[PDB]
Amino acid sequence: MKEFYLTVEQIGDSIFERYIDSNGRERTREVEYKPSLFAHCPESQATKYFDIYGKPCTRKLFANMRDASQWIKRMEDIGLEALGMDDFKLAYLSDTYNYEIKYDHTKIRVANFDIEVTSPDGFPEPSQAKHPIDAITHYDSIDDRFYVFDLLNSPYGNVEEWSIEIAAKLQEQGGDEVPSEIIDKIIYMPFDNEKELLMEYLNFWQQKTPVILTGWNVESFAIPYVYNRIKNIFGESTAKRLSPHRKTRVKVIENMYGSREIITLFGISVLDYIDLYKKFSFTNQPSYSLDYISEFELNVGKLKYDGPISKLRESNHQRYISYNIIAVYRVLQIDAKRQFINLSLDMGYYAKIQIQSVFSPIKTWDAIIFNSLKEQNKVIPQGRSHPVQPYPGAFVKEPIPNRYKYVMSFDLTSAYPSIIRQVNISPETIAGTFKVAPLHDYINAVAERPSDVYSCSPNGMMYYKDRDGVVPTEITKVFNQRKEHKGYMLAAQRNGEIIKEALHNPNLSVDEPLDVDYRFDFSDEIKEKIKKLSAKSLNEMLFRAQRTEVAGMTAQINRKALINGLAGALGNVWFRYYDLRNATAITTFGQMALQWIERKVNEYLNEVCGTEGEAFVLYGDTDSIYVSADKIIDKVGESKFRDTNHWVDFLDKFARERMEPAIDRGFREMCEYMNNKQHLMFMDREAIAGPPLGSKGIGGFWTGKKRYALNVWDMEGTRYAEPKLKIMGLETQKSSTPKAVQKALKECIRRMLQEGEESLQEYFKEFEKEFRQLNYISIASVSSANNIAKYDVGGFPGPKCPFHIRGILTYNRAIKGNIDAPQVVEGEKVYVLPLREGNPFGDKCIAWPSGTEITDLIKDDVLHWMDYTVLLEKTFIKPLEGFTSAAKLDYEKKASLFDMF
DNA sequence: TCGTGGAAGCAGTCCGCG
DNA sequence: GCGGACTGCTTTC
Ligand SMILES: [Ca+2]
Ligand SMILES: [Ca+2]
Ligand SMILES: [Ca+2]
Ligand SMILES: [Ca+2]
Ligand SMILES: [Ca+2]
Numbered sequence: 029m030k031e032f033y034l035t036v037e038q039i040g041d042s043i044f045e046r047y048i049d050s051n052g053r054e055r056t057r058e059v060e061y062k063p064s065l066f067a068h069c070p071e072s073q074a075t076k077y078f079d080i081y082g083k084p085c086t087r088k089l090f091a092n093m094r095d096a097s098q099w100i101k102r103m104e105d106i107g108l109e110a111l112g113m114d115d116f117k118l119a120y121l122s123d124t125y126n127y128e129i130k131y132d133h134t135k136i137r138v139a140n141f142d143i144e145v146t147s148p149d150g151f152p153e154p155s156q157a158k159h160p161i162d163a164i165t166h167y168d169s170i171d172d173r174f175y176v177f178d179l180l181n182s183p184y185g186n187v188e189e190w191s192i193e194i195a196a197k198l199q200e201q202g203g204d205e206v207p208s209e210i211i212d213k214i215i216y217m218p219f220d221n222e223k224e225l226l227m228e229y230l231n232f233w234q235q236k237t238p239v240i241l242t243g244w245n246v247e248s249f250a251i252p253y254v255y256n257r258i259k260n261i262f263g264e265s266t267a268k269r270l271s272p273h274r275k276t277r278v279k280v281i282e283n284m285y286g287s288r289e290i291i292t293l294f295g296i297s298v299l300d301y302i303d304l305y306k307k308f309s310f311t312n313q314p315s316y317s318l319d320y321i322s323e324f325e326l327n328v329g330k331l332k333y334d335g336p337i338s339k340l341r342e343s344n345h346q347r348y349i350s351y352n353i354i355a356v357y358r359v360l361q362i363d364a365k366r367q368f369i370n371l372s373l374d375m376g377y378y379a380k381i382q383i384q385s386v387f388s389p390i391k392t393w394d395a396i397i398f399n400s401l402k403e404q405n406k407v408i409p410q411g412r413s414h415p416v417q418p419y420p421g422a423f424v425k426e427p428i429p430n431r432y433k434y435v436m437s438f439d440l441t442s443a444y445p446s447i448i449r450q451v452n453i454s455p456e457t458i459a460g461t462f463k464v465a466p467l468h469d470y471i472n473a474v475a476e477r478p479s480d481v482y483s484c485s486p487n488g489m490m491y492y493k494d495r496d497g498v499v500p501t502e503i504t505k506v507f508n509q510r511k512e513h514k515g516y517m518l519a520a521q522r523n524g525e526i527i528k529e530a531l532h533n534p535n536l537s538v539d540e541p542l543d544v545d546y547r548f549d550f551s552d553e554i555k556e557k558i559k560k561l562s563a564k565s566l567n568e569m570l571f572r573a574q575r576t577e578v579a580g581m582t583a584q585i586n587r588k589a590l591i592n593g594l595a596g597a598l599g600n601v602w603f604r605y606y607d608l609r610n611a612t613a614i615t616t617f618g619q620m621a622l623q624w625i626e627r628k629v630n631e632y633l634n635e636v637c638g639t640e641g642e643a644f645v646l647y648g649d650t651d652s653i654y655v656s657a658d659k660i661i662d663k664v665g666e667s668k669f670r671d672t673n674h675w676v677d678f679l680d681k682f683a684r685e686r687m688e689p690a691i692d693r694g695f696r697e698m699c700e701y702m703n704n705k706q707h708l709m710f711m712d713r714e715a716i717a718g719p720p721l722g723s724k725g726i727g728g729f730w731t732g733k734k735r736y737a738l739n740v741w742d743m744e745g746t747r748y749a750e751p752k753l754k755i756m757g758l759e760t761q762k763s764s765t766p767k768a769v770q771k772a773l774k775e776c777i778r779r780m781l782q783e784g785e786e787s788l789q790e791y792f793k794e795f796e797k798e799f800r801q802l803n804y805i806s807i808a809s810v811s812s813a814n815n816i817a818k819y820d821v822g823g824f825p826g827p828k829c830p831f832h833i834r835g836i837l838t839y840n841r842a843i844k845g846n847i848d849a850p851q852v853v854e855g856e857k858v859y860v861l862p863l864r865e866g867n868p869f870g871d872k873c874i875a876w877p878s879g880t881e882i883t884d885l886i887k888d889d890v891l892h893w894m895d896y897t898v899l900l901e902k903t904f905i906k907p908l909e910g911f912t913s914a915a916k917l918d919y920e921k922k923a924s925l926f927d928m929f
Numbered sequence: 930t931c932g933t934g935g936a937a938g939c940a941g942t943c944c945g946c947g
Numbered sequence: 948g949c950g951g952a953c954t955g956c957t958t959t960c
Contacts, residue, residue, distance in 0.1 A: 279931095281930090281931055282931075283931070284930080285930090288930095290931095307932080388932045388933090390932080390933065391932085419935080420936095421934070422936065423936090424936060424937075444934090593933040595933080595934070596934035597933050597934080598933085599935085600933055603933080611934075614934095649936090650935095731938095732937095733937060735938070757938065762939090764940090811940095812930080814930080828941095828942055829942080830941070831941055831942085855930050856930090
């Protein structure tokens with residue numbers, strides 16, 4: 029096999045590298061890597077190295093890395109550019125792996141671990157590490173085993189061994205329901221004392237040294253805790269054995285308000301699953317507890333126990349250990365679904381970076397672009413300092429608030445990346461400027477043509493047309509990967525809908541799910557077999573299709589994010605190729621494209637309808653348009669349609685055969701006007717939306733910018749078995765809105781769009797009547813809580829104190845003098861509830877950590893004093909009043925003359 | 930919330946508005 | 948009560 033790196037570090041003048049050799053063995057080597065950097069030289073001097081602008085460079089070979097670093101400083105002192113890759117380990121990987129890396133995940137040791145620490149005096153601070161570590165479960169991907177290190181004797185209790193037999197039993201038999209599929213993979217080791225536990229853990233770690241290290245909050249909790257605990261007991265030299273090169277560094281992580289410490293383990297790549305999840309999942313959750321996320325992702329019930337976690341070991345050590353094991357497995361289950369480790373390895377090896385650098389799109393792109401340019405003997409520019417400056421972004425049309433019955437949407441495929449490719453926007457392709465007219469003059473095609481030589485953006489920039497820039501070239505490669513995976517995602521999605529249809533008529537039989545590849549549209553033969561399957565087999569096939577869809581979503585959406593991040597990186601001052609001329613060239617061209625095509629679509633439709641000045645485009649945001657299709661439906665007449673699916677077919681065909689060709693002609697003209705390098709503005713139909721045929725549903729509504737709801741029958745070619753709501757911006761989509769309120773508001777919207785005013789009124793009346801029965805957590809608002817200290821004046825709210833912060837201060841007064849009461853953590857999320865006048869908490873609201881029950885100390889009082897009237901008014905009635913007034917609809921029946929009978 | 934970008938909505942504070 | 952200026956938070960692209 030081809031060799032591939034596992035990890036790489038610079039330690040002084042050595043590169044330390046762990047790698048898989050040509051026989052598939054893990055190896056480690058220290059290399060006295062001599063880096064090269066570059067300086068501009070005279071033309072007369074012959075060379076093969078040129079900067080991205082075509083100016084010649086001399087290569088300077090250094091005796092070691094420290095000499096290279098010192099040279100960069102002196103070049104700054106002198107006032108001259110020091111060119112080349114200044115992150116020497118990236119240069120080392122470029123030299124050592126000068127080919128497309130093919131990696132084999134089965135040879136990469138992925139470790140997933142979790143620790144337990146009993147603490148009677150509140151949260152066990154990792155920087156102090158003053159309490160024993162009393163359990164570690166460490167899953168190893170190469171062994172496929174859960175290694176359980178269990179402390180039997182501690183100053184907080186002596187306990188009996190954990191029983192695998194009880195662990196396996198049902199909760200109803202008094203067991204822990206440790207899943208049967210992992211029971212045989214558990215390797216259980218009990219210890220008489222903590223010192224032996226940890227010494228054995230370190231020996232184990234040396235034998236089975238993680239390459240990728242993950243878990244839940246491992247970077248902020250488990251890793252620093254283990255390191256500092258070992259450090260306190262044995263000294264630093266022993267704690268440093270967690271690094272395969274015996275080197276660690278406390279790293280200070282700064283943000284706007286405050287900072288925290290982590291431990292950098294040289295030669296390990298830590299990918300904390302909480303951070304993977306936050307970056308790659310595209311959710312926003314009200315809580316990031318593993319229990320909460322596990323329930324959300326896997327539909328597994330929360331891990332239940334009696335009493336506080338600080339007494340769980342002593343009261344029920346059996347359950348304590350089982351829950352530590354299950355916690356590790358839950359993360360593995362999330363990853364089996366979401367495949368974020370796979371994504372990380374893919375992108376890391378593609379860019380040739382430390383795998384943990386996948387968290388930084390700037391680092392990722394710097395490496396991709398460096399490797400690309402190096403292949404052509406080109407030399408990257410030095411990074412420079414820039415002051416942060418604001419710059420303009422997208423255009424958003426102000427919609428007229430209203431119901432909108434029939435709607436077709438269209439938007440550009442990978443808009444900003446396509447603009448980069450079309451215009452040829454790159455650091456080295458800048459050809460000059462032209463005199464800009466107002467944007468409006470380009471939109472209406474009255475401005476002078478910018479150039480007859482170069483490719484232009486309406487911000488005044490011109491670009492070469494003779495050759496692609498490195499940014500277009502590399503962005504295209506990832507775009508093509510993205511497109512492949514999106515294809516698999518949409519096929520799986522379409523396949524899912526076939527199974528849902530078939531589930532209407534399941535067969536009374538015993539059979540098996542079909543062995544198929546859900547990434548490809550089902551053949552006719554597969555469709556026929558599906559129609560004969562049992563509900564059991566169908567449901568298993570649906571689950572598998574949906575997992576295939578998720579896998580495709582992860583792969584495509586994060587490649588989309590990476591390429592969009594490159595457009596964004598051009599406006600980040602730390603990026604080697606930062607240039608507001610290029611970032612603004614993209615955004616300003618986008619504003620033009622949207623408004624240009626709005627004008628073309630209105631012109632086209634006014635022509636087919638034989639009108640003038642009518643607005644068919646009702647909305648658009650960045651790269652999208654929403655087109656009213658009422659007149660198109662009315663030209664055929666609603667009476668002529670057999671069913672909903674018939675007019676959906678008709679609109680689909682109209683979009684594909686009339687609108688899209690008009691749109692494409694419109695954009696081809698714009699390409700020629702701007703003299704661009706290649707026409708790549710592809711604006712495909714997204715959604716077909718409307719009410720069910722013959723219903724009194726309104727189909728859709730907008731309340732304002734970034735706030736609308738649509739009843740969609742077809743999305744990017746997926747014809748749904750049941751209509752799906754596309755809701756953007758409304759309270760149903762916000763993590764701050766109470767869970768039960770999201771649900772009720774969504775049902776109000778479904779009724780408005782599908783059934784009509786009367787249905788909406790029936791549901792409102794019932795929700796208003798019953799909502800006081802809802803569980804307090806389900807009707808709590810949610811908010812992130814920053815700057816708690818700034819607004820804390822002797823335990824009471826200071827000037828301008830935010831409502832949620834006030835709630836936290838109320839909570840803190842109510843639990844004062846309790847070391848064991850859950851503390852609200854700066855920067856994390858809280859549930860918030862309003863309190864009625866004259867309550868014992870002495871204020872109008874209270875807040876507590878999200879994803880948790882409020883401590884029993886005060887729960888009963890909170891329940892008694894909860895202000896249901898305020899909660900209803902604020903979170904449900906106010907937003908619903910906004911929806912219905914926009915839609916010209918009443919949520920309460922107005923009186924009429926018929927009342928007099 | 931360490932980690933690409935800008936646009937823009939709503940809640941709530943403070944306080945004006947005769 | 949409603950809005951503007953401002954902060955805080957959140958979402959949509
Ligand atoms: Ca735990
Ligand atoms: Ca798009
Ligand atoms: Ca059937
Ligand atoms: Ca869009
Ligand atoms: Ca599309």
